[PDB]
Design a binder for this molecule. Structure first.
Ligand SMILES: CCCCC/C=C\C/C=C\CCCCCCCC(=O)O[C@H](COC(=O)CCCCCCCCCCCCCCC)COP(=O)([O-])OCC[N+](C)(C)C
Ligand SMILES: CCCCC/C=C\C/C=C\CCCCCCCC(=O)O[C@H](COC(=O)CCCCCCCCCCCCCCC)COP(=O)([O-])OCC[N+](C)(C)C
Ligand SMILES: CCCCC/C=C\C/C=C\CCCCCCCC(=O)O[C@H](COC(=O)CCCCCCCCCCCCCCC)COP(=O)([O-])OCC[N+](C)(C)C
Ligand SMILES: C=C(C)CCCC(=C)CCCC(=C)CCCC(=C)CCCC(=C)CCCC(=C)CCCC(=C)CCC[C@@H](C)CCOP(=O)(O)O
Ligand SMILES: *[C@@H]1O[C@H](CO)[C@@H](O)[C@H](O)[C@H]1NC(C)=O
Ligand SMILES: *[C@@H]1O[C@H](CO)[C@@H](O)[C@H](O)[C@H]1NC(C)=O
Lengths: 690, 731
């Protein structure tokens, strides 16, 4: 009618205004850096100085922190430490205003989300005051974080997901392609803010699979229409959210182009491309004798060629040649002429340029032995022989002959000769016939815990382990552009490797870390700043009205899919009309699947997990709680006493999350007291809140 | 042999009834004389094959030293610690002592010839006899699963011929009792399948499924995966019983609750009984209980655990601290220096009692008083032997050097001449992990569990499970860590004595090992060793290379003979080829089903897909958890899943004979006689790798089909004739 249009217009701006008030009330009060504003504020400061860095998370959240830096009048000059006050030129209130504006847009998007997943009108208001009045969302909204951004693109992913579901009756329409593309863009932004945005794309993806599964059942759907459904779902659900991801690494790689911290995680050609460039040399590449080099392995895990002064205790008693991964003067090497020819002298006139395909002897500078493989087997790998250094220019054998073999040339010069950083060369023995290889594993402690060097009989040229390049040259030129897909793959594999380095040791008590079963039932919270009586001190836990009742709604619905499934097998017909089945499927079932996909990896994985990882997984849980008010009280709408009891149960629980949000409000609104004034909201132990 | 489906009409869709007739029970059991004659012939053939040439490897074989030596530990009674549950080691102890075995032979290392005092051929006979009964249980399991008589005959003959079970069952190994009780669990549960779930026969089959299922679970922890397999099978059967409308709801809850009682309460009951016979028979104390708590060891006989120590401890008492969480713990300090840091006197966790574990509690500031150790008392630990304090200068740790936390603690000081504030240790009693009373207030020996906070660094006294190789071998590390784990920070005091206390002092001793604490503590050591079992065994295999039979494991090499585990490959590759073909054909039946074409019309195809989902699920639940294990594992961990694979391939030969060659069953029997004949040919060719009998080298080179498996192929002679003129060495 006309009143429902009035509520449908003026009510989203009441919830919007309460989101602007709930997330921006004490933004500029703390005046100190907090939980991960120290990290992500620094990462946003890296984009303003255009300096390269490395981080676990995909860059769209950090590029939006940098976008808030451009919108805050800030040039990135101040790194963000922990605990310290802000300088006067950095206006942190604009950035906290920016991300609290993202959560302040996460609330009305939950209003229209609940307006989309069926939900007779009191359930939309309960779900909107349920996402709205929460101290966890309004705590992590308050800061320079990409947890608010991950929450916003997760809620936008589910909103455009149901707004894609609602035009399932009219496929290939303007609304169908519209919300399919908006679904793809929001999903790709959900990955590119943080990698645990894969989880929603599992859920949506499972939905997509079910659609294609049930599109086999349509006898009226032709094969042309069905293959068009496949092309539409792979375009707007695979091609688009991966193209947004690639575009975020295009703005990431093409935006920052200087040197910074974490620059050593890249191949040295990409490090040579950027403006800092502490790994390159201008005029010359390499020559004979006088060119002192340090040779790097291009494989993931390979390092510099090291030769320390000790000898082998296992073998023919020659010098140990291994691979070490830091700067050292003992990593220096140079080339010399082969066996039978007179070697290099320091008073030569012809600066000879090296020729590939010709044998040379790699002589170390600070020690002075020949690079060699000797007929004693390698210690760890018993298949191949062992690499050592022996003698000098006149003492050795015929097995010291190592050729230089061209694999790839990175243009802009003569590709026939050996070069620095533009020559992936293999080193092959002449008499034996083995390629110089590296296993990448660890050695025992006789060789000071360094890399294993082998020489395989028959490897293939498609292996990255035998490729070597010159990194440092010692006695007008711009390095070419690297491939963007290769920098994409190597930087993502470096992100995965830093995720492998994030596993904690069990001997150390991480005071900040938590387990996933503690995030429902509120066993522990999270302490986000310094707990002195001066600063306002903030705390992370949900309102125990929303996520206790939401947690028992998840446990009360996960044991309702089973009951309706048993009664389905017992020939009951539960959900007759497509309306209540639509509210079950989109309002109840897929938030249970998205709850499990956003929550169960955090209880399965062996990684450091915190309370702020539960903020997307709570959201779908809250939707389930709205469904536990929607279908659970739907039968009461026919009797007038059931109507009045239903509206006072909606208004009773909504008022209960008003009162329980407002009671626990200073842990999101600030706690300006001396931390002993706030023991009244210290209900349990392990809530280290006072 | 298999009946037609009995589907009825529900109010919405047709439902299948799940009450089998008595005719279904009569067609699948030994009701005739020809079937009993073929079980007799299969038991004669299996009893020849699985038991041939026994005691010809008259030395110990791979992991016969372990479970044989542990059987010797049960006969001697001295306590040992092993990964595995007791029943299939204590069972070799009962088979040993029933044959006249009195310990006396430590099963040391592979190659030790048996003296004429140890019964091994009777233990080998027990292992190979259970490995010969699992063949007959595969025949009867398969026939109970709904299967032609002759195809189960030829498939079970094809299972007695499988090489990996003759190798794994012939020797003193855990997988032949394990595989017997797993085969008895699928046996008794398929016997439960064919009964109408209300009669007394079905509850006898649930009772045998319970005692065999938990007698598999108490032999090795892959039997818990058979508990999981039977459990998912029961979710299947309760799903179809809910689908059945002629069954009342009270009957479905009765089958579900009696199924829950016989299938979890009986495995847990038999598991607790078998650990009670474990803890009841293994009474003595040896070096095997080196890493248990002193209350655990307090139940064992012939103890060196200190009993009746002085409870109330004062300042001036010569005490000995002991680390709670790490089992090898005492505060230890002897005159040998570090190679790094300050190179002072080292502080270690030495697990045994010495005089160097003694520490005076002296005040920071000797009187005639007895000042108690209250909560918050800063003291100094004065080592009485080497004349030194406990000192926590901020230098590099010895072996945990990559630590921004974990400050290093050492020993340096002069009594009365060099006493500073950097030797102070505030005692902070943890009031949760200590027992309440006086010990929760002040320090009591064996009863409180305090934490030593260093007073001038704010860091606590810490230790963990990393030893020190520099000096003081097999001794751990003492540090002073901030934000170290609260479990690893707890210390408690024992073996205290001071002259400022009367002789009639209230002594204290340890709680003596309650069974639940014995049980849970023992299982924490089970899971702790089983989780942290990383060793370089060159015959270690990979779980994703098991279903292709490349690079099998080696067993024994002596006197120009060798024993090597490599399964029957022409059966192995048809098991896993049938995993691929059945997965592909059930994908094409789902796509072909929903695309519009009808599937599952003939009842033999329905029972085929039902039982191969049942056995493919046994292949899944016994092999998929072997990927989520961060430990070492070999080819004999695939083998409980491989039993379900040869069950499923049994049904594959049944769908070759029974459905796709209905008009011409001579060609189905031709396919099964070529598969069986090729299997028995693979056994007859690879018989001298199982029993440790003579091959020749010119055939040992030819037999290696894949280059993956390699078993010291130059060990054999040039011909068999040289084996008759041979004397053999005995280690
Ligand atoms: C403070 C908040 C706490 C959270 C709420 C807690 C519990 C309530 C949860 C669910 C209420 C039911 C809403 C979903 C059911 C939709 C299906 C439906 O409604 O259909 C129901 C059938 O389903 C059922 O009876 C079975 C579901 C009952 C499950 C509730 C008990 C589960 C266990 C609870 C334990 C809780 C604690 C556990 C953890 C400690 C009737 O079919 P019909 O033909 O009339 O369908 C309408 C068709 N016409 C329109 C033609 C009439
Ligand atoms: C995948 C892992 C799954 C793990 C969980 C597995 C099982 C537990 C699931 C549910 C347990 C409660 C089931 C209540 C269903 C009510 C249906 C109903 O109310 O309808 C009942 C049917 O009774 C049933 O069939 C219930 C079967 C019992 C299910 C199996 C027993 C549970 C096993 C215990 C496991 C532990 C449980 C606790 C775990 C937290 C009334 O039917 P009727 O014959 O009177 O009317 C005829 C229908 N006309 C009118 C249309 C014709
Ligand atoms: C019929 C439906 C009834 C239900 C049964 C369902 C499935 C039964 C099949 C397999 C049991 C599940 C076990 C794997 C589950 C976890 C997946 C996993 O993870 O393993 C997968 C694949 O491994 C497998 O090759 C599974 C082998 C299954 C047996 C053979 C299947 C057929 C293939 C041969 C077909 C031959 C051609 C046919 C025509 C002749 C990878 O392993 P990964 O990630 O550890 O590798 C990474 C290792 N790093 C971490 C160290 C790097
Ligand atoms: C619903 C009903 C009506 C009735 C109920 C139905 C039912 C019977 C069950 C309801 C259905 C159900 C799902 C149950 C849960 C299963 C249950 C009881 C318990 C969980 C069992 C588990 C899967 C896991 C936890 C336990 C572990 C300690 C597992 C550690 C694994 C191992 C590391 C094994 C190592 C052994 C070997 C591999 C290596 C050594 O090899 P070597 O010899 O040294 O080389
Ligand atoms: C960045 O802004 C601050 C604000 O005072 C200024 O001091 C600094 O010089 C600026 N740096 C650059 C590189 O513009
Ligand atoms: C030390 O405290 C305990 C705690 O009750 C008390 O029993 C004991 O008498 C005290 N020591 C002295 C010397 O009073």
């Amino acid at each position: 009618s006309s009143l429902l249009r009035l509520e449908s217009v003026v009510m989203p701006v009441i919830f919007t205004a309460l989101a602007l008030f709930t997330r921006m009330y004490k933004i500029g009060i703390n005046n100190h850096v907090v939980w991960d504003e120290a990290h992500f504020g620094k990462f946003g400061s890296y984009y303003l100085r255009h300096e390269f860095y490395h981080d676990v998370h995909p860059p769209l959240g950090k590029m939006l922190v940098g976008l808030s830096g451009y919108l805050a009048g800030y040039n990135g000059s101040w790194d963000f430490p922990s605990g310290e006050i802000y300088p006067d030129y950095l206006d942190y209130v604009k950035m906290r205003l920016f991300n609290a504006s993202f959560s302040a847009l996460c609330v009305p998007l939950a209003y229209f989300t609940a307006k989309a997943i069926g939900f007779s009108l009191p359930t939309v208001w309960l779900m909107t005051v349920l996402v709205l009045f929460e101290n966890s969302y309004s705590t992590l909204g308050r800061f320079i974080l990409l947890d608010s951004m991950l929450l916003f693109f997760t809620v936008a992913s589910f909103f455009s997901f149901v707004m894609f579901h609602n035009q399932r009756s009219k496929p290939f329409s303007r609304k169908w392609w519209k919300w399919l593309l908006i679904t793809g863009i929001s999903l790709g932004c959900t990955i590119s803010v943080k990698m645990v945005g894969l989880f929603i794309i599992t859920m949506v993806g499972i939905y997509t699979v079910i659609d294609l599964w049930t599109f086999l059942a349509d006898k009226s759907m032709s094969w042309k229409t069905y293959i068009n459904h496949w092309l539409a779902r792979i375009f707007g659900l695979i091609i688009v959210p991966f193209c947004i991801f690639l575009l975020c690494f295009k703005i990431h790689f093409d935006l920052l182009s200087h040197s910074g911290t974490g620059d050593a995680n890249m191949p040295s050609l990409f490090q040579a491309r950027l403006v800092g460039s502490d790994v390159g040399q201008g005029p010359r590449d390499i020559a004979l004798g006088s060119s002192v080099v340090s040779i790097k392995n291009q494989a993931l895990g390979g390092s510099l060629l090291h030769s320390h002064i000790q000898t082998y205790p296992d073998g023919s008693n020659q010098q140990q040649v291994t691979c070490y991964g830091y700067k050292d003067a003992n990593n220096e090497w140079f080339f010399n002429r082969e066996r039978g020819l007179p070697s290099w002298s320091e008073n030569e006139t012809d600066i000879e340029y090296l020729k590939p395909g010709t044998s040379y002897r790699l002589v170390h500078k600070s020690t002075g032995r020949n690079l060699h493989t000797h007929p004693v087997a390698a210690p760890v790998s018993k298949t191949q022989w062992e690499v050592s250094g022996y003698g000098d220019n006149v003492v050795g054998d015929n097995k010291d002959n190592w050729v230089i073999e061209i694999m790839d040339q990175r243009g802009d010069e003569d590709p026939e000769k050996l070069h620095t950083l533009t020559t992936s060369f293999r080193i092959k023995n002449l008499e034996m016939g083995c390629y110089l290889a590296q296993t990448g594993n660890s050695l025992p402690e006789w060789g000071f815990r360094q890399q294993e060097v082998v020489c395989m009989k028959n490897p293939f040229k498609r292996d990255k382990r035998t490729w070597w390049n010159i990194e440092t040259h010692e006695n007008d030129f711009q390095y070419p552009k690297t491939n963007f897909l290769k920098d994409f793959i190597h930087l993502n594999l470096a992100m995965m490797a830093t995720n492998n380095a994030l596993v904690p040791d069990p001997d150390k008590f991480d005071y900040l870390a938590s387990s996933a079963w503690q995030w429902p039932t509120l066993n522990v919270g999270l302490r986000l700043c310094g707990w002195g009586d001066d600063n306002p001190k903030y705390f992370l836990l949900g309102t125990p009205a929303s996520t206790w009742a939401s947690s028992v709604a998840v446990l009360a619905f996960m044991a309702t899919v089973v009951i309706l499934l048993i009664r389905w097998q017992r020939q009951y017909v539960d959900l007759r009309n497509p309306s209540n089945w639509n509210v079950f499927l989109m309002g109840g079932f897929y938030p249970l699947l998205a709850w499990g996909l956003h929550y169960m990896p955090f209880v399965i994985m062996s990684r450091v997990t915190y309370v702020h990882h539960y903020l997307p997984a709570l959201y779908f849980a809250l939707i389930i709680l709205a469904y536990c008010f929607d279908a659970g009280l739907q039968k009461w709408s026919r009797s007038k006493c059931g109507r009045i009891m239903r509206f006072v149960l909606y208004a009773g629980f909504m008022a209960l999350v008003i009162g329980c949000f407002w009671y626990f409000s200073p842990i999101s609104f600030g706690m300006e007291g001396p931390s002993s004034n706030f023991r009244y909201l210290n209900w349990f132990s392990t809530w280290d809140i006072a | 042999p298999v009946p037609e489906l009995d589907i009825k009409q529900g109010p919405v869709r047709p439902f299948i009834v799940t009450d089998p007739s008595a005719e279904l029970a009569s067609l699948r059991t030994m009701v005739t004389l020809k079937e009993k004659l073929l079980v007799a012939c299969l038991a004669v053939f299996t009893a020849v094959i699985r038991l041939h040439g026994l005691a010809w490897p008259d030395s110990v074989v791979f992991d016969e030293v372990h479970f044989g030596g542990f059987a010797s530990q049960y006969i001697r009674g001295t306590y040992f610690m092993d990964v595995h549950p007791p029943l299939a080691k204590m069972l070799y102890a009962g088979v040993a002592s029933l044959g006249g075995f009195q310990g006396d032979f430590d099963f040391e290392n592979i190659g030790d010839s048996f003296p004429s005092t140890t019964p091994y051929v009777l233990m080998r006979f027990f292992s190979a006899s259970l490995g010969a009964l699992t063949v007959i249980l595969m025949y009867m399991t398969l026939r109970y699963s709904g299967v032609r008589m002759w195809v189960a005959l030829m498939s079970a003959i094809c299972f007695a011929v499988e090489n990996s079970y003759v190798t794994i069952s012939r020797y003193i190994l855990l997988d032949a009792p394990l595989m017997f009780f797993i085969a008895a669990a699928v046996y008794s549960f398929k016997k439960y399948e064919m009964y109408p779930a209300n009669s007394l026969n079905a509850y006898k089959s649930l009772l045998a499924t319970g005692i065999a299922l938990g007698m598999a679970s108490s032999s090795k922890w892959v039997g818990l995966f058979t508990v999981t397999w039977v459990g998912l099978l029961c979710i299947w059967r309760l799903w179809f019983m809910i689908g059945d409308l002629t069954k009342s709801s009270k009957s479905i809850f009765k089958v579900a609750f009696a199924k829950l009682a016989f299938l979890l309460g009986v495995p847990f009951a038999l598991y607790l009984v078998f650990f009670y016979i474990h803890f009841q028979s293994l009474t003595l104390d040896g070096d095997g209980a080196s890493f248990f708590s002193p209350e655990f060891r307090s139940t064992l006989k012939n103890n060196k655990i200190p009993q009746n120590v002085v409870a109330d401890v004062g300042i001036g008492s010569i005490i000995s601290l002991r680390h709670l969480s790490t089992m090898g713990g005492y505060l230890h300090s002897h005159s040998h220096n570090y190679p790094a840091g300050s190179e002072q006197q080292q502080s270690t966790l030495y697990p045994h009692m010495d005089a160097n574990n003694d520490w005076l509690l002296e005040l920071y500031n000797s009187l005639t008083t007895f000042q108690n150790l209250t909560d918050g008392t800063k003291v100094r630990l004065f080592h009485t032997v080497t004349r030194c304090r406990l000192h926590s200068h901020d230098h590099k740790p010895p072996v945990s050097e990559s630590s921004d936390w974990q400050k290093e603690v050492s020993c340096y000081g002069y009594s009365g001449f060099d006493g500073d504030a950097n030797d102070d240790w505030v005692v902070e009693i943890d009031k949760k992990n200590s027992a309440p009373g006086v010990a929760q207030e002040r320090v009591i020996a064996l009863d409180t569990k305090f934490r030593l906070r260093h007073a001038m660094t704010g860091c606590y006294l810490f230790s963990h499970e990393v030893k020190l190789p520099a000096w003081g071998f097999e001794q751990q590390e003492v540090t002073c860590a901030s934000s170290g784990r609260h479990d690893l920070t707890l210390w408690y005091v024992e073996n205290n004595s001071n002259p400022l206390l009367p002789e009639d002092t209230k002594r204290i001793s340890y709680k003596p090992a309650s069974f639940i604490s014995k049980f849970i503590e023992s299982h924490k050591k089970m899971w702790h060793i089983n989780k942290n079992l990383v060793e370089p065994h060159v015959y270690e295999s990979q779980p994703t290379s098991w279903p292709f039979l490349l690079r099998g494991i080696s067993y024994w090499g002596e006197n120009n003979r060798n024993v090597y585990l490599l399964g029957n490959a022409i059966v192995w590759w048809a098991v896993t080829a049938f995993i691929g073909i059945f997965g592909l054909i059930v994908i094409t039946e789902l796509f072909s089903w929903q695309l519009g074409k009808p599937i599952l019309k003939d009842s033999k195809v329905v029972n085929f897909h039902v039982q191969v989902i049942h056995y493919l699920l046994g292949f899944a639940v016994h092999y998929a958890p072997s990927f989520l294990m961060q430990r070492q594992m070999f080819l004999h961990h695939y083998l409980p899943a491989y039993y379900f694979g040869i069950l499923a391939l049994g049904h594959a030969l049944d769908i070759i004979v029974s459905y796709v060659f209905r008009s011409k069953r001579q060609m189905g029997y031709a396919v099964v006689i070529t598969f069986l004949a090729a299997s028995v040919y693979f056994f007859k060719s690879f018989s001298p790798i199982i029993y440790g009998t003579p091959w020749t080298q010119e055939l040992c080179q030819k037999s290696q089909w894949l280059s993956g498996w390699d078993y010291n192929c130059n060990t054999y002679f040039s011909s068999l004739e040289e084996y008759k003129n041979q004397t053999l060495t005995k280690r």
